[PDB]
Write a protein that binds this DNA or RNA. Structure first.
Ligand SMILES: [K+]
Ligand SMILES: [K+]
Ligand SMILES: [Mg+2]
Ligand SMILES: [Mg+2]
Ligand SMILES: [Mg+2]
Ligand SMILES: [Mg+2]
Ligand SMILES: [Mg+2]
Ligand SMILES: [Mg+2]
Ligand SMILES: [Mg+2]
Ligand SMILES: [Mg+2]
Ligand SMILES: [Mg+2]
Ligand SMILES: [Mg+2]
Ligand SMILES: [Mg+2]
Ligand SMILES: [Mg+2]
Ligand SMILES: [Mg+2]
Ligand SMILES: [Mg+2]
Ligand SMILES: [Mg+2]
Ligand SMILES: [Mg+2]
Ligand SMILES: [Mg+2]
Ligand SMILES: [Mg+2]
Ligand SMILES: [Mg+2]
Ligand SMILES: [Mg+2]
Ligand SMILES: [Mg+2]
Ligand SMILES: [Zn+2]
Lengths: 305, 115, 154, 99, 59, 110
RNA sequence: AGGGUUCAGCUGUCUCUUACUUUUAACCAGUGAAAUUGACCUGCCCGUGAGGCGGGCAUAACACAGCAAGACGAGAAGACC
RNA sequence: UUUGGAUCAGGACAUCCCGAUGGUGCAGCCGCUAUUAAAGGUUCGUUUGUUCAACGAUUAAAGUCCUACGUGAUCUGAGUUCAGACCGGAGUAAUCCAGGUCGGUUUCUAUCUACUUUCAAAUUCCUCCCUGUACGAAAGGACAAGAGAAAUAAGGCCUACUUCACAAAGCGCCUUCCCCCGUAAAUGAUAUCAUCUCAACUUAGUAUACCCACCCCACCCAAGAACAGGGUU
């Protein structure tokens, strides 16, 4: 009948022991999944038109400028893919949809702040609990065995991706800040009306139409940006340099997948399918995968023609 | 930068642009959708009781990086067809008129300095 | 929208906030232990912590001397600051103050906190202590730790 | 001078001659080579007296002798700041107060 | 076999089924053919619902 | 804006006796291990706090009577000694505050 | 400190608003009004003469913060025969 | 003989522009007419100012209405008109005049209904290639698919600039993905021809995206009015 936490009754001689034990267990579980192709992987199929592959869960670090060989500057957002894994697979018939579904988790958190059901679900999977879980729609030939890690090499430079995340919330806001209403002038006899919306409806209806723009809570909702390309990939740190800005604050979790735009469909022929497997790879990837237009930092000063 | 009723400085050697009272012409219309004139835009001036089209070459408002910022809002007069009224420009002007799309070769040829 | 705002809005303005924090800090310096509303104590804790570092800077330092002169309204406390508190915490590198919550005052049911400098001469507060190592859960965890350690040694 | 490599001034007999010369030179440029570099637009179609074309590194100005006399560009581009007109124009002046 | 019902006359392209979502400009009218293509049981469900008595027992 | 009708007692009950309006019970109450009085888990025990405060007030009264005037803060450490107490070997060069009472059990000397 | 207008400067009056502080505000504790109120178990569209009528549609109960389209909001009184 | 302005606008088409199609002019460029089409847009100012009079410069266009001037418990100007006063006129006078002019206080603590993120398909110009091409005697001058640039709208962001500084913001940056069916045409009896068909028939334009689990005292928070939510390894 009384609430409790993990270290309520633990003594001074036992708190560090528990902390180090759970930390070492989490590290061991994370390291034990680094060889997916040796732990009886699911069959790998060649790429086919009309196939959709799984995405990633990244963390928004920040932004930095990046110049092209044409001398144009573009801002790139750093998305760090850390502790991203596939959790479970659901068939098309069981999901009762047109496409099959796959679950992806990332950014491991403490086991002491999660529900019993989630803890026991992760116990059989043998991974520390993740912060967020997302669902991706894939085809039958894109299935990946559960527990398989994923890396930033899953994407390649020159590929267009879409990013969805919860935007920065602003709480309760007025019409001027929320819907861009112009308000009223500040002088010439105006009486306590400078940001007021003004008229709300017409006099005949005697009501307010549903969906009327009114003050209320703004932000903190899921938004998606489409048509963002990849300029650079850091393999050592598992970092994607996506073009432009992405929704959400710093150190937030963003779901990234291939672009759904019809103008960019059927561009995954050269992309890894169903994903990149460093353990079974014949060759080691370079430290940073650039784009053809990206001027590398080590490259000499660019001279135009 | 430059919009309606904004004083501008005429930089070429046009006799129309030469003001004996040291009065500055002010724009009355900007030939852009949003009415805000950046470098290379075309505006209209009410100068000496005449309405003359003009080409803005530099403005005080900040712009992109590596692009010069001038301490005065500069403009050069143009005719109704594109031939500049003046003959030469003394003050330096940005080279970005080359990159920008428009009828600028005459002004670049009659210009003296670049920044 | 207040994101990243670390300074609370208190008093009649910035000047009033600074003056209230200065008075609380002077009282804490003089008495080695005070009680005050929780928000004000939490705001004053940082200044209290940094004052000890400014004292460690040394009295001969002009900047430290001026800072102490500003932040101590009673001038008899500056020699105390530079000759008692700083030598006491000379060995330590942080955590010079401890703050605890106390029952709400009967006047207006405000949230009250008591803040004191460590090492004072006053009677010890009834500090909250974790469960003893001899309880059932601690004994079981200690047995687990011993077994794991001996297994690793073997 | 940070402008170009070759600056060309050409005087024709008529506006039709200017237009024909511009059309022929741009047609030859498009048909000859350089599929990669950007196209060049005819600059000054509505201007009968003056016409200009700006290639990648060569700029050509077609203009009647009257317009050439009005804007003599040869001395301007040979003498930088040592031109007649430029000398006749004050470099910079600022009005002061009155008495 | 609600998909294989038969409408006498030109009802398949004359009858309409109009609904409003409550938002401005949300007045939508779809013919019998369009409604049958979208949902094969909607015609029969709407017919029986309309013929049922109008009280709390209809649901 | 003026009301158009009198709100009835049934509506008033439905508004006043709503679960949001009701007082929520607390499950963070436990007995103090020392004195046995009730306390909150995150809040210091009122009884122990007030006894410590009274002892501190007496000590501060003694300190003030010893200093005998404002702007007279000493520049040396302070040691509080009760009846039948002597200054310690390491408690030398410190201002001694004498007390005419037995040392409290919870006041563990250093 | 009369009624209009003008030259220059000046400025968030505006282009197009933004940031901060105080007050207000929201929550906790103490004290504690007024106008108003036939009863209400107080929905939408169309029609009729509108929350209460007719035909359809909608529909578990309930608390808090805003909003001012309707309750010819007593609202708000004045003006006209 | 009543009426404007600000803010927010909802709906109708009797469609100003953006869309298809027929006729139509001597080839294109452009024009007129006719059908269908409400998904989207329809500018800034000056003297005035009972909102209509005169306009200037732009744009693809600067559409007509209803909504109790739509909208004043959101604000505001003029009149309905006043209490003071003058000039012109009427009246012996008090006083009056739709005549001309100056000045001149509508107050409100939301009880009820309705609503408070439509969980996302973008619109329009300009420039270059085609191309000085077809076409044209010349004058002139397009197609169709393409590429770039700009503006607005919607949704986000702070790496630079700027307002400013653990952050918010624009003047800054990033992204933006389908049709529209008016009719033009094969074969063919009634009416053995012909006929696109309120004949049986053919052909042309006749979905995906995001949410998808279920310790909490206390502390922190890019989350937040309270509540709720995320983290505390
Ligand atoms: K409302
Ligand atoms: K009345
Ligand atoms: Mg927030
Ligand atoms: Mg915006
Ligand atoms: Mg404004
Ligand atoms: Mg005001
Ligand atoms: Mg007032
Ligand atoms: Mg205050
Ligand atoms: Mg209040
Ligand atoms: Mg209260
Ligand atoms: Mg009363
Ligand atoms: Mg009801
Ligand atoms: Mg009737
Ligand atoms: Mg009615
Ligand atoms: Mg009824
Ligand atoms: Mg309410
Ligand atoms: Mg007005
Ligand atoms: Mg029509
Ligand atoms: Mg009205
Ligand atoms: Mg109203
Ligand atoms: Mg008046
Ligand atoms: Mg008035
Ligand atoms: Mg109000
Ligand atoms: Zn106790």
């Amino acid at each position: 009948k009384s609430g409790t936490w993990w270290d309520e009754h633990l003594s001074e001689e036992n708190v560090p022991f528990i902390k180090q034990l759970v930390s070492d267990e989490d590290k061991a579980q994370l390291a034990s999944k680094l060889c997916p192709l040796k732990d009886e992987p699911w069959p790998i199929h060649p790429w086919e038109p009309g196939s959709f592959r799984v995405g990633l869960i990244a963390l928004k670090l920040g932004m930095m400028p990046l110049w092209t060989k044409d001398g144009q500057k573009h801002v790139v957002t750093l998305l760090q893919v850390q502790d991203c894994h596939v959790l479970k697979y659901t068939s098309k018939e069981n999901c009762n949809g047109k496409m099959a579904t796959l679950s992806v988790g990332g950014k491991t958190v403490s086991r002491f702040r999660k529900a019993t059901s989630i803890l026991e679900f992760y116990r059989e999977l043998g991974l520390p609990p993740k912060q967020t879980v997302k669902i991706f729609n894939i085809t039958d030939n894109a299935a990946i065995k559960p527990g398989t890690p994923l890396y930033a090499a899953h994407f390649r430079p020159g590929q267009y991706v879409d990013v969805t995340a919860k935007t920065i919330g602003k709480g309760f806001q007025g019409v001027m800040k929320r819907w861009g209403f112009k308000g009223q002038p500040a002088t010439h006899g105006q009486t306590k009306t400078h940001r007021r919306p003004g008229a709300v409806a017409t006099g005949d209806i005697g009501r307010v139409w549903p969906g009327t723009k009114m003050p209320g809570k703004m932000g903190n909702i899921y938004r998606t940006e489409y048509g963002l390309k990849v300029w650079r990939i850091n393999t050592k740190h598992n970092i994607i340099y996506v073009n432009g800005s992405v929704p959400g604050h710093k150190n937030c979790l963003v779901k990234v997948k291939d672009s759904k735009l019809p103008a960019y469909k059927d561009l995954g022929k050269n992309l890894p399918f169903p994903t990149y497997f460093p353990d079974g790879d014949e060759e080691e990837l370079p430290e940073d995968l650039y784009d053809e237009n990206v001027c590398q930092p080590g490259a000499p000063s660019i001279t135009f023609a | 930068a430059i919009q309606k009723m904004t004083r501008v400085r005429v930089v070429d050697n046009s006799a129309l642009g030469n003001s004996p009272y040291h009065r500055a012409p002010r724009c009355i219309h900007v030939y852009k959708k949003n009415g805000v004139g950046k470098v290379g835009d075309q505006i209209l001036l009410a100068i000496k009781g005449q309405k003359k089209k003009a080409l803005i070459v530099g403005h005080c408002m900040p712009g992109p990086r590596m692009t010069p910022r001038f301490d005065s809002n500069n403009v050069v007069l143009i005719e109704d067809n594109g031939n500049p009224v003046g003959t030469r420009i003394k003050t330096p002007i940005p080279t970005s008129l080359r990159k920008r799309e428009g009828e600028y070769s005459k002004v670049l040829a009659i210009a003296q300095n670049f920044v | 929208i207040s994101h990243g705002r670390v300074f609370r809005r208190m008093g009649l303005g910035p000047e009033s906030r600074i003056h209230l924090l200065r008075n609380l800090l002077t009282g804490l310096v003089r008495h080695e232990r005070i009680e005050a509303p929780w928000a004000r104590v939490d705001e004053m804790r940082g200044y209290a912590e940094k004052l000890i570092d400014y004292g460690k800077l040394g009295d001969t330092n002009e900047r430290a001397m001026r800072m102490a002169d500003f932040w101590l309204t009673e001038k008899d406390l500056i020699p105390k600051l530079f000759q008692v508190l700083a030598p006491r915490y000379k060995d330590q590198t942080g955590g010079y103050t401890r703050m605890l919550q106390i029952p709400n005052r009967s006047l207006d049911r405000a949230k009250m906190a008591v803040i004191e400098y460590k090492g004072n001469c006053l009677p010890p507060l009834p500090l909250p202590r974790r469960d003893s190592h001899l309880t059932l859960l601690n004994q079981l965890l200690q047995g687990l730790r011993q077994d794991l350690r001996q297994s690793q040694e073997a | 001078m940070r402008y170009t490599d070759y600056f060309v001034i050409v005087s024709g007999t008529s506006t039709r001659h200017l237009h024909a010369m511009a059309f022929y030179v741009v047609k030859m440029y498009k048909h000859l080579k350089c599929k990669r570099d950007p196209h060049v637009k005819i600059e000054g179609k509505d201007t009968d007296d003056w016409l200009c074309v700006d290639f990648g590194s060569m700029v050509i100005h077609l203009m009647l002798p009257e317009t050439r006399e009005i804007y003599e560009l040869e001395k301007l581009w040979t003498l930088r700041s040592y031109d007649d007109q430029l000398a006749q124009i004050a470099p910079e002046t600022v009005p002061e107060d009155f008495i | 076999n609600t998909r294989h019902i038969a409408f006498s006359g030109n009802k398949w392209e004359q009858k309409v089924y109009s609904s409003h979502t409550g938002y401005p400009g949300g007045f939508r009218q779809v013919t019998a053919a369009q409604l049958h293509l979208r949902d094969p049981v909607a015609i029969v469900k709407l017919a029986i619902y309309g013929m049922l008595p109008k009280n709390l027992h209809r649901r | 804006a003026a009301p158009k009708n009198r709100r009835t007692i049934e509506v008033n009950r439905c508004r006043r006796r709503n679960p949001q309006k009701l007082i929520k019970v607390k499950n963070n109450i436990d007995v103090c291990p020392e004195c046995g009085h009730l306390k909150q888990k995150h809040v210091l025990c009122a009884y122990c706090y007030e006894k410590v405060c009274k002892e501190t007030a007496e000590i501060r009264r003694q300190i003030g009577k010893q200093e005998g005037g404002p702007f007279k803060a000493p520049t040396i450490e302070t040691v509080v000694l009760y009846t039948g107490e002597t200054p310690s070997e390491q408690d030398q060069g410190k201002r001694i505050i004498e007390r005419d009472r037995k040392r409290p059990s919870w006041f563990t000397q250093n």
